Design a protein around this nucleic acid. Structure first.
Ligand SMILES: [Zn+2]
Ligand SMILES: [Zn+2]
Ligand SMILES: [Zn+2]
Ligand SMILES: [Zn+2]
Lengths: 162, 162
DNA sequence: TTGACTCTCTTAAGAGAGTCA
DNA sequence: TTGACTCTCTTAAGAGAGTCA
């Protein structure tokens, strides 16, 4: 695609195909001891994946369409954001899974932000636990918690001070 | 080296020279709108760095010691935890800078944990902002905040639901 | 034009080891 | 022995591009 109208058509056909991906219901923590429900449209574990889809990595996929004899390829989860800026504050925009399910391509579960913002959601308390993200989280964050630290700050002598 | 007494000796000489690195005071956000003061023992920007230290990368250093005519080498931030398990639940233990200051080698600003627990501290609200890390954070975390999302969850048609 | 594979690269939090003097 | 450089690798969040029928 090249014109905004052609990109819209690419987005429409992508939504049409992903819409038919198996929809899986997941019960997730929202923070604050609350539990929620998220519906993920998951790409198959193996070929075929869907019209226009091909796997380029263990958990990486691409969407391809041939408009006017020329082939076009986009990362699997980047299609919904084809009409938005591709960088912000000098950082590349990436498809961030609000649901934290890589195979999911439900666009209602993705946002477009920098890699740092993207990664950080892994540790967010959730929409019901104190999330402060402007584009709010859909669920807690798989890594949120006390952690499992093996050894904390310590010294054998007295050469240091906090 | 190999023995417990030889390892302690390594931790002791390491602390001694690091205990001589220039001490820089850093005022940091603690969360909850409070501010704290950290004392980082920062390795010099260029050689010489200190007895046993050598720079292997822009912000990477290694500590070296000749024990029984045979030279031993460790990542400069790992020495304090030479006696602790090197993995947890199958994950490599990592030297986590509680002060988010790479050049700092103050053991009172370091903890031993998985890379995931390590990274997650970049987004922690802080000791006074809601930090729930078992081994408490020393400061908020450089990346905590609303983020700068360019586009949130959206769909053009009606094939999806949250 | 398409599907199903192949390949290496980006970011930052971290690592290992080799070459010289 | 100790110092000062060189190189590539690891892990998860995420990418682009080539081959072949
Ligand atoms: Zn999802
Ligand atoms: Zn959040
Ligand atoms: Zn420090
Ligand atoms: Zn914390």
């Amino acid at each position: 695609a090249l014109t905004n109208a052609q990109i819209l058509a690419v987005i429409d056909s992508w939504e049409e195909t992903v819409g038919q991906f198996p929809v899986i219901t997941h019960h997730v923590p929202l923070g604050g001891g609350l539990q929620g429900t998220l519906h993920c449209y998951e790409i198959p574990l193996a070929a075929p994946y869907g019209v226009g889809f091909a796997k380029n990595g263990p958990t990486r996929w691409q969407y391809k369409r041939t408009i006017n004899q020329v082939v076009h390829r986009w990362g699997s989860h980047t299609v919904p954001f084809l009409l938005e800026p591709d960088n912000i504050n000098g950082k590349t925009c990436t498809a961030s899974h609000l649901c934290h399910n890589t195979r999911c391509h439900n666009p209602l579960h993705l946002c477009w932000e920098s890699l740092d913002d993207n990664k950080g959601r892994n540790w967010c308390p959730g929409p019901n636990g104190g999330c402060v993200h402007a584009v709010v989280c859909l669920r807690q964050g798989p890594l949120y918690g006390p952690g499992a630290t093996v050894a904390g700050p310590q010294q054998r002598g007295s050469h240091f001070v906090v």
